[PDB]
Chain A
């Protein structure tokens, strides 16, 4: 399992899963990522995300 927003490797028995009505489910590592996901925040503009560290460098 890899966090939908942060892109971090989710440890076992940790994190929450969010299931939307469009049949797509996302699993998150903490409430910090889930809150930013719900605000339509681009993970490529957040410096500490694993996705940002791949696009750059």
Chain B
């Protein structure tokens, strides 16, 4: 018999199975489609989510009824200290997809990058890249490197630079760096390798990769929740109060005679540590150099982007950062992989200029009142302590 009434199915089958990831960092399964009529450039980065705040921004779109004094928006702060490029790899197009050909590495490798090649560092001999470094300048090894460079220019189609973070610049307790392969989209493969070689051992900033008021994609791992029922996993209806043996379950898990439970039925299981890519994320402020502060042309107080008492569970942001309109997957301290949009958004809201009027740096605990800790002391004035 048919169901009496119709309703959309609960949950999405575009993400089945709901298997939790193993590595905190999430790898972009794609890069923006290459154009060979432009100068080579980097098409990705990697930052650490600090927290969230809200800003008042002035609307520049026309033919809209939004208030002239400003609209309240939520923004996520992604601290992105400079990266260190420690090698590059060429990929070839074969009948089984891309196949890496060679990986040329730099002469000097940081201890942050070496920790990735072990599991118990404090017991290791820490001899990673030792033979590579000690024999870097030998004619036998120098000749081999020139062959590796020439091999890529002859039989490769994709170049990616192996860049890693610097964990000393962030309040995280992890010391081992996070390694990401960032593709070079640009001219011919001859000048891609030329551009790649120039970047060895150099430091890259987020401003060189992303511009101003640019829509990007974000890939990260969502916040974990452990084992969960069908009401939270799939949002099914709770059963009436009278029900024997419990309310929060799916009553019928299949008809009689497919004789098996279908893969489409909502079942309990793991929700949480899932990889998700969200596209069309606007960059509000490119917090590099001049814009490293939280001041605006309207609100001219010199205040750091960190709220009073620091970002909850994170700490203090003292490096470059990005302001993203809205929410991104993952809790604070999560590693965030950034990338240029594969399909750029041409909507009038995507091309719209961003002009901020106010950035909220009040404390994120409780019902705070003051923006800077100085103006808290000004309003309250002297207290019993200090004066006694």
Interface residues of chain A, those whose CB is within 8 Å of chain B, are 8-9, 11-14, 29-30, 32
Contact = CB atoms under 8 A, between A and B. Distances in A.
Contact of B54 (A9, A13, A30): A13
A29 B72 contact: no
Given A11-B360, A13-B54, A13-B56, 5 more contacts: A9-B379, A11-B368, A11-B369, A13-B360, A32-B367
A30 B368 CA distance: 10
6 contacts: A8-B369, A11-B370, A12-B56, A12-B360, A30-B367, A32-B367
Interface string B319-363: 000000000000000000000000000000000000000101010
A55 B56 CA distance: 35
The 9 closest A-B pairs by CB, nearest first: A30-B367, A13-B72, A12-B358, A13-B54, A11-B369, A12-B56, A11-B362, A8-B369, A13-B56
A14 B54 CA distance: 11
Residue with the highest number of chain A CB atoms closer than 10 Å, among B56, B360, B369, B371: B369
Interface of B: 54, 56, 72, 358, 360, 362, 367-371, 379
A29 B370 CA distance: 12
Q: Chain B's interface: helix, strand, loop or mixed, by majority?
A: loop
A34 B358 CA distance: 26
B369 A29 contact: yes
A30 B358 CA distance: 21
Contacts of B56: 12-13
A52 B379 CA distance: 15
Nearest to B357: A12
A29 B54 contact: no
A9 B370 CA distance: 9
A29 B367 contact: yes
Nearest to B299: A12
A57 to B, nearest CB: 11
Contacts of A32: 367
Contacts of B367: 14, 29-30, 32
Contacts of B370: 11
Contacts of A11: 360, 362, 368-371
A27 B192 CA distance: 60
Contacts of B368: 11
A12 B370 CA distance: 10
A9 B358 contact: no
A9 B369 contact: yes
A12 B369 CA distance: 9
A30 B370 CA distance: 14
Residue with the highest number of chain B CB atoms closer than 10 Å, among A12, A14, A30: A12
Nearest to A32: B367
A11 B362 CA distance: 9
A43 B269 CA distance: 53
A12 B360 CA distance: 8
B121 to A, nearest CB: 46
B172 to A, nearest CB: 30
Nearest to A6: B369
A32 B371 CA distance: 20
Contacts of B54: 13
A15 to B, nearest CB: 9
A9 B369 CA distance: 8
Contacts of A14: 367
A14 B72 CA distance: 11
